[PDB]
Amino acid sequence: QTLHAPHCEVGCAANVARRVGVDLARQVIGAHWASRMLVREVGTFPQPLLDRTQVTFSAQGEGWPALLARMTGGEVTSRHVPREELLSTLHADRAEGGTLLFMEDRACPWLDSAHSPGMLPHVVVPDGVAPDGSWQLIEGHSWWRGRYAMSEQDLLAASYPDPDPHHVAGRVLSLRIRPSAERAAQLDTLARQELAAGLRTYLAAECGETETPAGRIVWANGPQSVPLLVERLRGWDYLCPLAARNDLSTEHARDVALGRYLFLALTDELAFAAYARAGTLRLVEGLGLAGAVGGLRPDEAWRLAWRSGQKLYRRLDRQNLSALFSALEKAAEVDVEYARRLLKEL
Amino acid sequence: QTLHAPHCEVGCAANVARRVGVDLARQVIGAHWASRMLVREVGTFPQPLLDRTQVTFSAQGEGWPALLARMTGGEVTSRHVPREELLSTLHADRAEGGTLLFMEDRACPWLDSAHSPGMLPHVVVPDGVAPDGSWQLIEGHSWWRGRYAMSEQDLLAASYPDPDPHHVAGRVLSLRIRPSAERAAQLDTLARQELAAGLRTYLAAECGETETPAGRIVWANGPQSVPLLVERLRGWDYLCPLAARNDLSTEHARDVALGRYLFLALTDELAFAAYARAGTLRLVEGLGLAGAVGGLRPDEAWRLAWRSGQKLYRRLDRQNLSALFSALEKAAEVDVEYARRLLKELLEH
Ligand SMILES: CS[C@H]1O[C@H]([C@H](N)[C@@H](C)O)[C@H](O)[C@H](O)[C@H]1O
Hints:
Shape of chain A: globular
Number of domains of chain A: 2
Bound molecules: ligand IYV
Oligomer: homodimer
Structural class of chain A: alpha+beta
Largest interface: A-B, 67 and 69 residues
Helix content of chain A: 40-55%
């Protein structure tokens, strides 16, 4: 069965990681405990790519590409490749891992997105050639998890589109991640070391700020990240009375739709947090530390906040806004007690 | 009488600069020739603030805060002020320039945005207390330009919103920019220098890439900036059949609204391009190089691309889309002929 994740690129990496005997969810993502509030907002003029104040959450920390590489000793590097050389690079990558292949949503018929290339590009994992000569594409997104066959012709049609709004033209992420059999024996040892290192970064609770052409990017780590996030998201309660009207302007229905999109993107991050925290718990139990840390369930607290984000996205009103904030405050407080307990035991 | 520009913060800065004998449109913005395409796109994972691929244009280059500080010997300083120090900051800043005071759209009643704090915060220039106790606020955006009165009570309440989605509570940009007597006379000298420095940067035509938590940010300077923009903007032609197709789900309808927003944002940057270009013309004259560039009107070319964008909001079809594309290639063409002549004429001395 095909592995999946709330972020489809992580699902893809998980399938690839399994080929080389690496458990991404448990040993890589689960080994990296993180909690960060991120804000894009007005800073120093000019910032022409700053289209709106924007807030979200991330439990990805450094991210799986940096951690998958670190821990396997291998390599997760991105690159554009010319159409003549694409079919071969796929077979070449599969030997030592695999490829994340970027295409538009309209290039994947199962996505049902013919009339639009999507807000962001999509990603699939090519899994070798079937008897027919048609390629096997692994879909990493939980909503469409599985295997889809696509003719070879369509694969270069999909990977080199015209026009190319997403600059997706033959873009590939190359996972060269096969651990040497000595490194492979060190995986749980290294996972336990990454586990402690992320917990220390979490409790260090550092703050940061950068000025970019897309705006000022603010971030805050650690136990205060979710209380700071909730405080900031209150600023969007104006969406509730606006969305309860049926006679919205064109300009006003745009406000609502971007605010709603802000809450969809956050909901996917809460799903990811629940997925990561489960991986951490499986890593903890496999390390034999579960009985020492206790029965706290940060993965469950984040799942409830995910569901509550879904509920807000479907019906953007004040009761569901307030219920999201309260589910997030609960996840913040189970997180910090679990983090402190787990670092103590390590 | 109130100055204005298509970006509200630029119109606000023009008003503060006039108070200290500096013509922002001519000596600061007109003295910074620039052309740049910006893309935000997928880069290294993870990038949680990367919500969509996005492309836009900028003729602002380094931007007026850097230029206006350099040229005046002063500073353009951002700061959050506690409530009990806002009025005194407003009064104290006015002697050396003034203040861009940040505000939610709903704080400014003339914006008719009571329902929303806006996608972005707004800025106004407080302009003293009137003999009746009321405060005067200068609106620097062309569509609302003028002076509005606010009571001190409403100004304080509006400058400290709770909650504060935009993070603008007591946030001020302090423009301490009064030139010394000697600097005031060297002004048009420095405006001449900045014009050449900016022209040389435009032809250096460098590009860059940064990886941020908001995505990979790609930029390109030079004569290739507008053809590159038109190439990438072709990627959004899918918006035409998508709009007016009446079986639209919440997600595909969100795609249409964000596409239209992309071109609304772009339209403002073309109107700024026409505004900056025109400022470069008026600077080229008091400098006396008008005759030695010919009759090339980059302001007029860019103003035709601006109008071409506004057509797109009312009707978003392949024709108006291609009309905007052709208008943009014209302005890019005019821009490189004009810049090549003016940089040669500048150093001909
Ligand atoms: C409900 S599909 C959701 O994600 C899409 C795609 N799967 C990603 C991976 O590119 C597109 O960005 C869509 O515009 C967005 O609404």
